[PDB]
């Protein structure tokens, strides 16, 4: 029986990986940050409130200039917002209203949008006609689009509920590499600061680290008991935090290859919808279905603060590239900016 | 006001965007949204053809009411991750084939799907329009194959009315929230004209109940 032998070899290989990881875990992060002063209490106030979406907000993404936002709602519209003045720069009618993700290109020229139509639409912001046009539709996924991130004006990574990720060349509209290996629906992506690597968490309770050019998985990270809904690299790109439906955040280190910290509380029993870091990486921000956001001390695992102020599930978060403000979106139809 | 001329034109463009987003939302608010659902190889396509790759949307108009139907078939992914997108649908049309009892048992799969949908936390107060399709083929088969093979405890004769009523009751007993949501059951065939009218009546009842909740009688 080749299959039985093959299953065995998988088992001893998994045991070897577990042993090599236990060998690496000489000390915990909680034992080294025990001499580090706590951040104290962090109070943040709403500074702006963004009104105009007439349905649940599913995704938002800051621009790299730290003023403009793209926000996606089930009302079938993207809104590009000026965060300083609250003015709406653009309103983009979507061909399909069942959007789940939105991306803003780092150059600022394009926005990506996708969802239950299994398509990633690229909208050109800067046209001679003075309107926003659909520049391309990327088809080829057989499950819904759950996340998308630009690497450049011509390359985008998407993740799908068909268990796979894809890297697309935008000019030709073709997949240049497909990333397979998750056995459940892939929920979220995060790109490394240098965009050579990216992590994806899926509904198999697993996060995989992928090399973009080679197109193959480098590492697999386990430990969550339920679906992973959110994932995010640490600022330097040597760690990432994941958030799941089991009411837990977990910080993983790429070079150590283990789980490094757990962020949970007995008073929290709801799923985690979104996670984000601060510029220094000292704060981990998470949005919950309890209708608020928690600010964790990412090195001491303490709860440092709370962002309350939403009437529904905090569906999405975003920390701005220059670090001044936090944005929260929600199923209550409103975006809020916090300082 | 300490705004530039260009700032004031930017604010004026933002307010125009406000107006149109309000017009779009008002137009959306007059719309009846239907979640079309059911097992594969059922009369779902028959229903769609009588009314008129991810989500498929169908739009039709009947008696000054505009209807949007969302076929979420061809989405082979975990339902729990996108079903909450349809929280706020006015009604769920659910297609079950009556001819599927003698084909695990396929009708039992339809019951499992119905049970998972009706008692979902996102559809607590969402009504269900249940279509039992292919009653003509069910008429033919009920002679050769009894309903006992599908239902061990059935104690009735091989007649359309009694077996059909048994199936309907079997489906309506899966409702664990009978005091919050109605189940409208219709017995339709391949060649019918009254399906749209039945959906219209059920949606009118749902609208009337929502208006009762708004006006304060409920």
């Amino acid at each position, epitope marked *: 029986s080749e299959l039985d032998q093959l299953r065995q070899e998988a088992e001893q290989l998994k045991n070897q990986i577990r042993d090599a990881r236990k060998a690496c875990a000489d000390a915990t992060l909680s034992q080294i940050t025990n001499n580090i002063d706590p951040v104290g209490r962090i109070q943040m106030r709403t500074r702006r409130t963004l009104r105009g979406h007439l349905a649940k907000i599913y995704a938002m993404h800051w621009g790299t200039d730290s003023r403009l936002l793209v926000s996606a709602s089930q009302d079938g519209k993207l809104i590009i917002w*000026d965060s300083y*003045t609250t003015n709406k720069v*653009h309103a983009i009618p979507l061909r399909s209203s069942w959007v789940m993700t939105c991306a803003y290109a780092p150059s600022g020229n394009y926005v990506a949008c996708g969802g239950l139509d299994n398509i990633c639409s690229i909208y050109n912001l800067k046209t001679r*006609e003075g309107n926003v046009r659909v520049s391309r539709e990327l088809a080829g996924h057989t499950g819904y689009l759950s996340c998308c991130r630009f690497l450049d004006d011509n390359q985008i990574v998407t993740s799908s509920g068909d268990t796979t990720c894809a890297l697309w060349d935008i000019e030709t509209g073709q997949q240049t590499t497909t990333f397979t290996g998750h056995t459940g629906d892939v929920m979220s992506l995060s790109l490394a600061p240098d965009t050579r690597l990216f992590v994806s968490g899926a509904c198999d309770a697993s996060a995989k680290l992928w090399d973009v050019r080679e197109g193959m998985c480098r590492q697999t990270f386990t430990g969550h008991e339920s679906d992973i809904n959110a994932i995010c690299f640490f600022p330097n790109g040597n760690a990432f935090a994941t958030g799941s439906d089991d009411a837990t955040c977990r910080l993983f280190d790429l070079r150590a290859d283990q789980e490094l910290m757990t962020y949970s509380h007995d008073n929290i029993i709801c799923g985690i919808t979104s996670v984000s870091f601060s510029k220094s990486g000292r704060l981990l921000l998470a949005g919950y279905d309890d209708f608020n956001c928690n600010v964790w001390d990412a090195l001491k695992a303490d709860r440092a603060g709370v962002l309350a102020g939403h009437d529904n599930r905090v569906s999405c978060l975003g920390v701005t590239d220059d670090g001044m403000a936090v944005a929260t979106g929600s199923w209550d139809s409103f975006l809020k900016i916090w300082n | 006001c300490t705004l*530039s*001329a260009e*700032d004031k*034109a930017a604010v004026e*463009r933002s307010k*125009m965007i406000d107006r149109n987003l309000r017009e779009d939302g008002e137009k959306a608010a007059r719309e009846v949204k239907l979640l079309l659902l059911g097992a594969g190889e059922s009369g779902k396509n028959t229903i769609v053809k009588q009314m008129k790759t991810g989500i498929v949307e169908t739009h039709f108009t009947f008696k000054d009411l505009h209807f949007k139907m969302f076929d979420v078939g061809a989405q082979r992914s975990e339902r729990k991750k996108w079903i909450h997108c349809f929280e706020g649908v006015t009604a769920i049309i659910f297609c079950v084939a009556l001819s599927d009892y003698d084909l695990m048992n396929r009708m039992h799969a339809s019951m499992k799907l119905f049970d998972s949908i009706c008692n979902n936390k996102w559809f607590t107060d969402t009504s269900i329009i249940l279509f039992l399709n292919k009653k003509d083929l069910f008429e033919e088969k009920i002679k050769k194959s009894p309903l006992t093979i599908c239902y061990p405890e059935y104690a009735g004769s091989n007649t359309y009315e009694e077996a059909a009523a048994y199936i309907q009751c079997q489906f309506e007993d899966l409702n664990k929230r009978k005091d919050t949501k109605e189940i409208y059951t219709h017995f339709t065939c391949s060649t019918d004209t009254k399906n749209v009218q039945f959906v219209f009546d059920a949606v009118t009842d749902v609208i009337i109940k929502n208006n009762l909740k708004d006006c304060g009688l409920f």
Partner: single-chain antibody
Amino acid sequence: VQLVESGGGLVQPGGSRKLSCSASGFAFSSFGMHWVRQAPEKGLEWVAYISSGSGTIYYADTVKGRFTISRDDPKNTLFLQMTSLRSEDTAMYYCVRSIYYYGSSPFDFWGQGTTLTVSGSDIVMTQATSSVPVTPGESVSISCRSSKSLLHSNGNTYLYWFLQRPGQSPQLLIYRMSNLASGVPDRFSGSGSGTAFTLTISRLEAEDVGVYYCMQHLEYPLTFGAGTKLEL
């Protein structure tokens, strides 16, 4: 993108004439539209402005009460009604598109214009030079000055630079001071401090010869500079 002006010709003093501007190739409803005149030998002068959606309308003090601006958005045309025409109204009229939002570039497309022949608190901007003899390949520095600082609490300095080539309509070069316009070579650059403004041209070409105009967009009326002409 095309803006084609129509009307014009010879008109008697005290009469009336209607100028039309047919827009094609862009989202006309989304754009504010200006009318700017150029006298037969003088520089540019802003005449009228109608915003997107007709919400706001501005006129110059020298035409208020005699001139009217309207837009028929469905038929894609802008109209100017002129009454009590004077001798000072003899000019070539340019229809200019403008769009306003964070990061946009106003005054970016100019029409071809039509010729009409008739038988105190304003910000004044001076280009203290009228001609600059130059040769290809060298650097050039043109200057403008403002009566009041064009810098705003926004951090925006509202200084536009325009180039008019011989027998042509003006072209936007630098829109908000130091921002290069679309399709403009990098040879051009802009700098300034509040009231003193410089346009720098590197590796000069034969195409770059023309008249350069500084404009302000702090408040209305919009004021153009006198213009500096480049020779050879």
